[PDB]
Write a protein that binds this DNA or RNA. Structure first.
Ligand SMILES: [Mn+2]
Length: 690
DNA sequence: TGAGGTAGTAGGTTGT
RNA sequence: ACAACCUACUACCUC
């Protein structure tokens, strides 16, 4: 029962390897390719330099200024990068020659494993080479690939037609690219290209597939953790059994062989009105931390009744059930009456004219949480696009928070009612509503009801829960940035309180004019965050923990310069969502890999955290990478804070994987990119999004 | 859009 | 030309 990482480390060292360096007076790409094809040898290059493992015989002309047999100069990034590319190319060459592998699209194609009804399922692997303090580390990740067995000629010969708008891909080595000797005019971008209608195939994306295949493709590519680890380790051992440029231990995969130390964090305690072990047991039979009064206005459409046999009495009794479930936990909702003046509106013609029939709707829906019951076919169809327009109007302009409920919830709720024969007049009946609540607590739809209620709460300023124990840091900042088309969006979080008290957003614009965040907005973020912290606590914070989504491209000097005025310590921790590695615990009693939530592998100032416990059907747990940049606090504290801050998912009763500072910053960035949110100033729980 | 998870597909994005 | 990422869209899964 030992910890395993999908990495290896070499017994050799960077400066203990002998290489050949050629120096010429981009640059030498064509020279390197010529030498590679002439001398069938692994080579690599950089700006004006070439490196190889063995001497080159057929020099193929040219005048290399210098030729040396030497070791690496480890104090230069150039040489370390060139050596990393050298080992990467050497491993690729070894895998291609002695193993039947191909370089297909950023990975290495392997032996076919499955084929179902004109769909070919391959196996792929990817390798990364790093130099970490005079040591050579190699990380490997396993994936799959999809293809169609038939090219265009076979389909034409079978008397099929090819649409001008098809998705076309050409299989030529690593280049890949997507778009009777027919001439095909393919539009990659702007100018057209011509091809002989051969070696061009339609894509095998999930979008363009057809049923009876997707249900099996998904079943095939979602395999257990044990299989995913065992196949990868088997192929890696086969590759290393015939590689001679580096050596490794008999079992290079355990964390002991790497520079990794094991830590195990523990589940925090949540506080509603006492100390609770879990959020689930706190929502069920438990009050709320900061309740209040909410007024909710209902939105209805005729199409939800014309197409689907649901009447407004069902919607209103559902709302009454929600209100009394809410009052069972210390919050009261009252139905607004401004919507009673307008009856029969929001017809299908209204949905085809959503733009010009919302100007007179603002006065009746103001100062309320607007529940919406629009039809999904209207929500998704491009002609109607009810969801996008509804959000961009309500939240985008009038700053009104809304929650959408589609049919599937409604008939799922009605099916159990019809099963037990409860369908009857159940309005303002305490016993009938009590038995409805009792029969709603015996199935998974209770979680749907609770998710809807939590969304309503957080949209109406209710603060569901907090952490029982204060974290090692006073307050947290969360940053996320998204790039779509030209413009970029920024999502921010100011978690005020060592337990989580103001999970509100940053009352600032996130629409970045430039490519990234400028220092001027970075200043204001923490400036008004500290001001809000003092406004809500009357005390300045001793330490502020910053979380960044991705890599910190901003300047380190600005944070120190602005936080030295108030004499506050900080951190610049980075969080990476795709580590491209796996974490496992192997059991020697019976060959099996498993995973345990709250596991940390640490080395220097870099750690791998396991924050989820997925089932076998879902797949395998996906680690998360923590890179602590600043040195102020002990790094065992930052990891624990990151793990603890991921239990403040006040919008759902499902365990979020990311911390609350980045998992909501992402949502804010998406809402700003599409325009479904506007800045709001206040001191309360403010999450207009989910 | 009840919410979350994970595993395919494609195209951006710095930065040396 | 490489690296690291990040994002979108579909898909099954559990609550
Ligand atoms: Mn929601």
């Amino acid at each position: 029962m030992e910890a395993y990482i999908t990495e290896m480390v070499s017994r050799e060292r960077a400066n203990e390897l002998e290489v050949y360096v050629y120096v010429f007076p981009e640059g030498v790409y064509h020279i390197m390719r010529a030498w590679q094809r002439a001398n069938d040898l692994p080579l690599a290059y950089n700006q004006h330099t070439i490196m190889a493992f063995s001497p080159v015989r057929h020099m193929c002309g040219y005048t290399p200024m210098e030729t040396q047999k030497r070791h690496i100069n480890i104090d230069s990034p150039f040489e370390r990068a060139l050596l990393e590319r050298l080992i990467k190319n050497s491993l690729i060459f070894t895998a291609e020659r002695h193993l039947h592998a191909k370089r297909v699209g950023h990975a290495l194609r392997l032996n076919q494993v499955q084929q179902i009804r004109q769909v070919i399922i391959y196996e792929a692997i990817e390798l990364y080479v790093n130099i970490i303090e005079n040591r050579i580390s190699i990380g490997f990740h396993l994936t799959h690939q999809f293809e169609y067995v038939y090219t265009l000629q076979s389909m034409i010969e079978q008397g099929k037609t090819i649409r001008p708008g098809m998705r076309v891909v050409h299989s030529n080595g690593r280049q890949h690219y997507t778009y009777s000797t027919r001439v095909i005019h393919v539009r990659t971008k702007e100018q057209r290209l011509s091809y002989a209608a051969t070696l061009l195939k339609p894509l095998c994306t999930f979008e363009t597939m057809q049923p009876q295949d997707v249900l099996n493709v998904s079943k095939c590519i979602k395999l257990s953790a044990s299989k995913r680890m065992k196949c990868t380790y088997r192929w890696i051992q086969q590759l290393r059994a015939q590689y001679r440029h580096l050596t490794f231990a008999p079992n290079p995969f355990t964390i002991a062989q790497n520079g990794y130390k094991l830590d195990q964090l523990s589940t925090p305690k949540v506080h509603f009105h006492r100390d609770y072990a879990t959020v689930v047991s706190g929502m069920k039979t438990g009050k709320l931390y900061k309740g209040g009064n909410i007024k909710i206005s209902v939105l209805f459409d005729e199409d939800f009744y014309l197409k689907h046999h649901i009447t407004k009495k069902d919607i209103y009794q559902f709302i009454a059930v929600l209100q009394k479930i809410a009052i069972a936990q210390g919050v009261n909702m009252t139905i607004s009456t401004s919507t009673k003046s307008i009856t029969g509106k929001f017809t299908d013609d209204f949905f085809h004219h959503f733009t010009e029939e919302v100007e007179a709707l603002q006065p009746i829906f103001a100062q309320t949480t607007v529940l919406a019951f629009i039809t999904s076919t209207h929500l998704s169809n491009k002609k109607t696009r009810s969801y996008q327009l509804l959000k961009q109007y309500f939240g985008g302009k009038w700053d009104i928070a809304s929650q959408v409920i589609t049919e599937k919830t409604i008939e799922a709720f009605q099916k159990i009612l019809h099963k037990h024969g409860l369908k009857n007049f159940y309005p303002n009946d305490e016993q009938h509503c009590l038995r409805v609540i009792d029969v709603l607590k015996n199935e998974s739809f209770y979680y749907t009801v609770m998710n809807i209620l939590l969304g309503v709460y957080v949209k109406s300023g209710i603060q569901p829960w907090i952490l029982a124990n204060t974290t090692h840091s006073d307050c947290f900042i969360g940053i996320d940035v998204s790039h779509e088309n030209g413009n970029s969006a920024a999502g921010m979080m100011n978690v005020i309180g060592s337990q989580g008290h103001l999970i509100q957003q940053a009352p600032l614009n996130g629409i970045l004019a430039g490519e990234k965040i400028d220092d001027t907005l970075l200043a204001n973020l923490l400036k008004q965050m500290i001001k809000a912290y003092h406004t809500q606590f009357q005390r300045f914070p001793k330490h502020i923990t910053i979380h960044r989504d991705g890599f910190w491209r901003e300047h380190t000097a600005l944070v120190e310069k602005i936080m030295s005025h108030y004499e506050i310590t900080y951190d610049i921790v980075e969080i990476i969502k795709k580590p491209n590695r796996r974490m496992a615990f192997f059991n020697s009693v019976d060959n099996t890999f498993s995973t345990r939530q709250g596991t940390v592998y640490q080395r220097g100032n870099e750690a791998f955290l396991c924050a989820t416990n997925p089932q076998q059907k879902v797949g395998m747990a996906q680690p998360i990478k923590i890179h602590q940049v600043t040195k102020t606090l002990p790094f065992s504290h930052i990891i624990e804070d990151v793990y603890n801050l991921s239990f403040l998912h006040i919008h759902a009763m499902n365990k979020m994987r990311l911390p609350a500072t980045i998992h909501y910053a992402d949502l804010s960035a998406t809402a700003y990119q599409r325009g479904q949110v506007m800045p709001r100033s206040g001191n309360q729980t403010n999450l207009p999004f989910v």
